[PDB]
Amino acid sequence: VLSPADKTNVKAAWGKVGAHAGEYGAEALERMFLSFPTTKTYFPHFDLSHGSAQVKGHGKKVADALTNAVAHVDDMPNALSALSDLHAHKLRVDPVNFKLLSHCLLVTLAAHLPAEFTPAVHASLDKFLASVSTVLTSKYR
Amino acid sequence: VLSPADKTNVKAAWGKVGAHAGEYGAEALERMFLSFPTTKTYFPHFDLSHGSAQVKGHGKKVADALTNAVAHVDDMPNALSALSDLHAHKLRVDPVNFKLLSHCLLVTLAAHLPAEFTPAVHASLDKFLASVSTVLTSKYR
Amino acid sequence: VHLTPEEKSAVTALWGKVNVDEVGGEALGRLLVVYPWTQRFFESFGDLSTPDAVMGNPKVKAHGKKVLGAFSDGLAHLDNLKGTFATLSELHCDKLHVDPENFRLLGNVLVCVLAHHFGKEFTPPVQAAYQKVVAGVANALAHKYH
Amino acid sequence: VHLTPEEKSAVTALWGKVNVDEVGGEALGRLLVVYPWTQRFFESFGDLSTPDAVMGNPKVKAHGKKVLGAFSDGLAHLDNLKGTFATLSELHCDKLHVDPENFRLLGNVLVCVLAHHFGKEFTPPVQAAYQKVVAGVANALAHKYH
Numbered sequence: 405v406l407s408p409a410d411k412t413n414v415k416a417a418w419g420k421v422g423a424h425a426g427e428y429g430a431e432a433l434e435r436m437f438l439s440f441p442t443t444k445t446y447f448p449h450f451d452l453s454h455g456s457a458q459v460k461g462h463g464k465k466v467a468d469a470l471t472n473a474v475a476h477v478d479d480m481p482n483a484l485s486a487l488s489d490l491h492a493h494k495l496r497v498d499p500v501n502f503k504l505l506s507h508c509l510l511v512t513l514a515a516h517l518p519a520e521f522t523p524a525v526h527a528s529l530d531k532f533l534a535s536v537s538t539v540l541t542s543k544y545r
Numbered sequence: 546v547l548s549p550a551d552k553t554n555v556k557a558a559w560g561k562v563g564a565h566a567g568e569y570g571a572e573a574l575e576r577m578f579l580s581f582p583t584t585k586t587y588f589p590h591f592d593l594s595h596g597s598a599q600v601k602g603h604g605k606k607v608a609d610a611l612t613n614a615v616a617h618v619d620d621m622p623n624a625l626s627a628l629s630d631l632h633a634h635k636l637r638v639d640p641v642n643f644k645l646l647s648h649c650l651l652v653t654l655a656a657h658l659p660a661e662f663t664p665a666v667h668a669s670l671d672k673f674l675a676s677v678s679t680v681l682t683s684k685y686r
Numbered sequence: 687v688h689l690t691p692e693e694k695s696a697v698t699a700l701w702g703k704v705n706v707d708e709v710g711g712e713a714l715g716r717l718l719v720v721y722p723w724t725q726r727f728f729e730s731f732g733d734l735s736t737p738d739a740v741m742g743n744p745k746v747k748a749h750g751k752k753v754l755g756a757f758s759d760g761l762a763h764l765d766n767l768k769g770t771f772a773t774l775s776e777l778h779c780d781k782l783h784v785d786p787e788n789f790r791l792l793g794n795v796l797v798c799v800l801a802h803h804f805g806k807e808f809t810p811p812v813q814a815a816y817q818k819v820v821a822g823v824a825n826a827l828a829h830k831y832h
Numbered sequence: 833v834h835l836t837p838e839e840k841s842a843v844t845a846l847w848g849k850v851n852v853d854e855v856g857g858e859a860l861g862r863l864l865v866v867y868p869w870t871q872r873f874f875e876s877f878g879d880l881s882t883p884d885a886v887m888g889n890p891k892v893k894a895h896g897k898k899v900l901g902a903f904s905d906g907l908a909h910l911d912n913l914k915g916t917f918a919t920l921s922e923l924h925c926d927k928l929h930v931d932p933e934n935f936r937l938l939g940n941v942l943v944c945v946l947a948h949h950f951g952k953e954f955t956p957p958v959q960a961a962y963q964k965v966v967a968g969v970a971n972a973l974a975h976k977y978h
């Protein structure tokens with residue numbers, strides 16, 4: 405469960421991210437494709453080169469979903485419901501991959517939040533992305 | 546989430562286990578120690594030899610916990626509250642190992658329930674053990 | 687992956703009793719039932735609407751025969767799994783875009799099917815040997831993924 | 833796992849800037865904060881009750897120095913990680929009873945610590961190189977587990 409401190413930490417971190425959310429989402433995907441090449445199997449229709457507009461556009465959408473999740477941190481299953489449907493029944497991304505993207509989002513946040521990425525905030529963000537991942541896979545079966 | 550059909554399937558399959566619950570628990574543990582030897586790092590205080598009283602005793606405790614969960618499948622968090630506490634605060638078994646024991650329980654059930662282990666029941670049992678595992682790790686952080 | 691001589695003997699002996707077409711259809715069917723997201727590769731295969739429809743689907747059964755046939759052949763080369771499955775690894779990465787986690791899920795389902803099929807003959811030591819094998823095959827099929 | 837010559841250069845270049853003592857304490861401290869069940873191996877280490885207590889704990893810092901020191905030594909040895917860590921692998925299995933999953937967790941935390949400390953310099957290709965490295969070290973340390 406996300407604690408009140410977790411929720412405070414997540415809002416603070418994501419708030420500092422602010423308008424860079426989309427750029428950081430794209431960076432996290434890029435990190436994912438390089439660090440965990442098997443994740444590329446879900447994007448054969450993308451140019452996955454550095455600076456790809458397709459990766460940039462998808463990163464914007466991922467980031468916006470996370471912003472929406474933060475804004476509904478007490479009511480995340482409904483906020484993410486359409487994305488839970490989409491991943492469960494259309495995209496059908498193996499659940500194992502959400503941990504990979506979550507790690508890469510954490511790494512991206514670390515690389516951009518020198519002041520904010522304390523051990524406590526680190527822990528909260530890890531819990532939050534695991535929670536988002538759990539919601540996103542909740543309708544798989 | 547566990548559907549009504551999942552609950553029906555689990556109750557029927559585990560009902561058949563009946564008096565063999567402890568035996569099957571011990572067998573699952575032995576299968577786990579042999580197939581996934583890293584799990585032995587949590588039992589250096591046990592005689593892990595085949596047929597040991599320690600492994601038989603622990604198998605029975607694991608099995609009875611599952612019977613408790615099956616009997617209270619509508620509210621497993623409350624049913625397993627003491628056990629969730631125990632694993633989170635004291636045993637601190639890494640969450641990855643719950644999938645290992647769950648696979649070995651599933652294999653043990655498949656080997657003893659030829660009539661009952663249909664594809665649908667297979668799926669329901671896998672979901673149920675994953676749900677139990679989620680409850681037992683829910684308080685880890 | 688490294689099997690002992692007795693483990694290799696155990697694998698070979700049990701597999702001699704396997705109807706590969708039958709176990710292949712059963713394992714692939716159960717994969718699609720137990721882990722339904724794996725259905726994403728098989729939109730062309732027709733009716734997958736229920737467990738019975740999946741298990742009874744002749745295209746599901748056909749691909750099951752094909753996959754487990756290749757698995758079976760690979761058991762002749764337990765000393766070279768990486769090399770034996772290298773060209774299939776390339777194909778699955780380059781053209782089929784199959785997440786290697788699918789290979790691990792199928793290995794797990796296969797172990798369940800063998801346990802269901804063989805009952806008590808699928809002893810804890812025989813299972814441990816087969817776990818090494820399905821891990822090794824999955825690792826071999828994943829090796830070329832770049 | 834095997835690193836590209838260019839991945840090796842990226843690893844070596846970044847590590848020349850790493851204060852192994854400090855990064856080591858930071859990484860072990862964060863492991864105990866982010867994945868607090870890992871504190872199970874450090875019962876005698878004193879106060880671990882809050883994040884500030886964990887990070888400031890002298891025994892945590894000292895052990896972090898020790899652990900990352902051995903990590904560092906291994907980076908001279910990237911084509912032979914299994915041989916390099918064989919002795920410590922046996923120790924962790926036989927005497928310390930440490931689930932090798934802990935090595936993967938520490939690997940993840942170390943990558944986060946490097947990103948946090950180095951910022952933009954920790955580029956996606958440099959991270960990718962370090963992921964291969966921490967995976968290889970974790971695998972090498974898990975290798976002797978029977």
Ligand code: HEM
Pocket residue numbers: 443446447462465466467469470487490491495497501502503505506536537540
């Ligand atoms: C925090 C985790 C994730 C979030 C918030 C997220 C969110 C999203 C969003 C918002 C979309 C666009 C939906 C639309 O346009 O209707 C999307 C699509 C997609 N996602 Fe996820 N996703 C996550 C994890 C993943 C992972 C781990 C993978 C695979 C490695 C993945 C693969 C895809 C693919 C292939 C698409 C379609 C892309 C396209 O063809 O345009 N997602 N996701």
Ligand code: HEM
Pocket residue numbers: 584587588603606607608610611628631632636638642643644646647677678681
């Ligand atoms: C997945 C379902 C699991 C269930 C239902 C379960 C249940 C239990 C129960 C009922 C006990 C005894 C509690 C008591 O004596 O008050 C116990 C203890 C224990 N469990 Fe879990 N457990 C599970 C998973 C695991 C796993 C995966 C591991 C490690 C691989 C593990 C490691 C232990 C250990 C080391 C003990 C203490 C054994 C002893 O000293 O007697 N458990 N568990």
Ligand code: HEM
Pocket residue numbers: 724727728749752753754756757774777778782784788789792823827
């Ligand atoms: C032991 C594991 C596996 C083995 C040995 C294996 C082997 C094979 C072989 C021999 C082929 C035919 C290649 C050709 O015609 O050139 C094939 C094709 C294919 N495989 Fe795999 N496979 C395995 C697992 C999987 C899994 C788990 C999936 C997806 C869930 C999968 C998806 C596919 C698909 C979509 C094709 C193309 C089928 C077609 O074109 O009709 N494979 N595989």
Ligand code: HEM
Pocket residue numbers: 870873874895898899900902903920923924928930934935938939969970973
């Ligand atoms: C991943 C890279 C790691 C390396 C290279 C490493 C290396 C070492 C070394 C050199 C020692 C000293 C052994 C001696 O003096 O005989 C040690 C001890 C120890 N390590 Fe590891 N270690 C690693 C990860 C871990 C992790 C992640 C954990 C647990 C979370 C762990 C648990 C321990 C424990 C409990 C000791 C004994 C500490 C004591 O004296 O109380 N190690 N390790």
